[PDB]
Amino acid sequence: EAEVQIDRLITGRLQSLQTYVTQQLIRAAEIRASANLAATKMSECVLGQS
Amino acid sequence: KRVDFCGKGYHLMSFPQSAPHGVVFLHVTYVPAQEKNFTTAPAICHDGK
């Protein structure tokens, strides 16, 4: 019975880890887009005139 | 006209080139050099003008 119990535990924990990883990937992509915008804004609105 | 968007320094033109799964740009840029120092003044008034 221990194999069955630990199998249930493992599958549940793996699903939770999958969810966390996917959320982290989405947030990282959005932050990367925002930082690209910030880099362009800093490069063009400081070292020159807009 | 926007600075440092394509190329570094002042921009003149660019040339595109193909790639396996992309594109390659060759930017031509103008850069000053061999500077000298001088004394300046805002505006010069002659005969009161």
Swiss-Prot record, chain B:
Glycans are attached at N37. Subunit of the fusion protein that is processed upon entry into the host cell. Mediates fusion of the virion and cellular membranes by functioning as a class I viral fusion protein. Contains a viral fusion peptide that is unmasked after S2 cleavage. This cleavage can occur at the cell membrane by host TMPRSS2 or during endocytosis by host CSTL. In either case, this triggers an extensive and irreversible conformational change that leads to fusion of the viral envelope with the cellular cytoplasmic membrane, releasing viral genomic RNA into the host cell cytoplasm. This is Spike protein S2'. It comes from Severe acute respiratory syndrome coronavirus 2 (2019-nCoV). The chain holds residues 1038 to 1086 of 1273 of the full protein.
